[PDB]
């Protein structure tokens, strides 16, 4: 079994350790998440942009 995120990204924010935030959407719901450090490294590495559709292996 796996915990998986999948959705369209609607907003992504970063600061000058670092703390950022993003919002995701499906056809049926929305959420905002606060990001820990290791996700900030992953999201900044892969140049995610608003309107992208993405899937995340939560555990990894």
């Amino acid at each position: 079994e796996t915990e998986i995120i999948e959705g369209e990204v609607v907003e992504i924010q970063i600061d000058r350790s670092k703390v950022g935030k993003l919002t995701l959407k499906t056809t049926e719901m929305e959420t905002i998440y606060d990001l820990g450090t290791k996700m900030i490294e992953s999201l900044t590495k892969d140049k995610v942009q608003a309107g992208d559709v993405i899937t995340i292996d939560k555990a990894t």
């Binding site: 995120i5 993003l22 998440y33 820990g36 450090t37 290791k38 990894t60």
Partner: protein, 57 residues
Amino acid sequence: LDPSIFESLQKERVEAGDVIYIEANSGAVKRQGRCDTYATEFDLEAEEYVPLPKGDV
């Protein structure tokens, strides 16, 4: 713990609040994830959280 075991904990990237298995004979050390009491530290973070063990210490 002896400093050899401490080196092994450090190599596994263990910190306080992690859930750990030590085998005292082998000197084997295994990280099993963060304890779920801290699962709300952030909304998204890359760790995997496990419940506090129900077995004997």
